[PDB]
Design a protein around this ligand. Sequence first.
Ligand SMILES: *C(=S)Nc1ccc2c(c1)C(=O)OC21c2ccc(O)cc2Oc2cc(O)ccc21
Lengths: 325, 8
Amino acid sequence: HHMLHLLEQIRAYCETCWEWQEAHMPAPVEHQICPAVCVLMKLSFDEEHRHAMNELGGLQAIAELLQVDCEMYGLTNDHYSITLRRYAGMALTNLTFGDVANKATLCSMKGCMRALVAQLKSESEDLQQVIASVLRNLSWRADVNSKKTLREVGSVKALMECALEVKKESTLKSVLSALWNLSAHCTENKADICAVDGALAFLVGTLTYRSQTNTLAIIESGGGILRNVSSLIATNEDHRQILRENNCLQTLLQHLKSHSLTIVSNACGTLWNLSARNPKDQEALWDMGAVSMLKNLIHSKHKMIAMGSAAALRNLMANRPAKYK
Amino acid sequence: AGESLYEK
Ligand SMILES: *C(=S)Nc1ccc2c(c1)C(=O)OC21c2ccc(O)cc2Oc2cc(O)ccc21
């Protein structure tokens, strides 16, 4: 009953906005919207409260509030507009978390999806962090239609272009988290990442990222994106050259020593694809001491570390240089 | 990367 009261205020304002849109300007501060959505943002963390929202159509009301405000004011620097979009996006993130129906519902609302992707160019990096968090959950365990819609709206190129100009670590985590999920969907999603100018140079840079807090989130995310797209880079000489001049192969060998099992797994997966069909990078891996380091990881307890290290070793051992023996 | 609630 109390949540119904809050959701009705949003829907009442949404209808007031659509009445103006058909004619042509209602402001959100006058109707007391940002306080109402701020309560729903906080209520969306609890699981029992999320079930109450889903029955009363809470995801649809909050999404349309975010949609209509983006269409009206655009990419404004107004505090009340941005703060409203932040609290709305934070609620949608929680509603999309662990709910296949809600992921499909927000994806199917194509007006809102276009409105979401446009906010990545905003000056507020807090807003970029909130938008990237929504796209992370939508990209995770996406159905066929949801995968196709995320590609249609152009979230892959928007997030990668955004990631270059990001300053804060919290924003950069959420953006790279979404791109890692998006890269795993299909081959065309991987091409869109590599197609962005200076994107591969950035992803190599994240391997040696100097973190503020004691966490390996940015290295795992950036290297995790690199692992997925390396299959396309393996069949491309131009992209390989970008990795050489930024020292990628030499860095990925250092990642084998890491205590983080994700970083080692990402490195072995990247070295699997890059080791095949290229005599130049093959000979480089022999010189840097890849055979010794990869031979240590063949007897690992985990599946992907053991599979990736053994497979990359197979490619190097099969194609020995003339210099050796 | 997985899924997550909002990084507060
Ligand atoms: C964000 S700035 N404030 C905020 C958001 C959500 C919650 C609180 C403050 C609080 O007091 O606890 C809740 C909360 C947070 C995290 C999880 O996992 C559950 C939960 O439960 C509820 C239920 C309500 O009816 C209101 C607030 C919170």
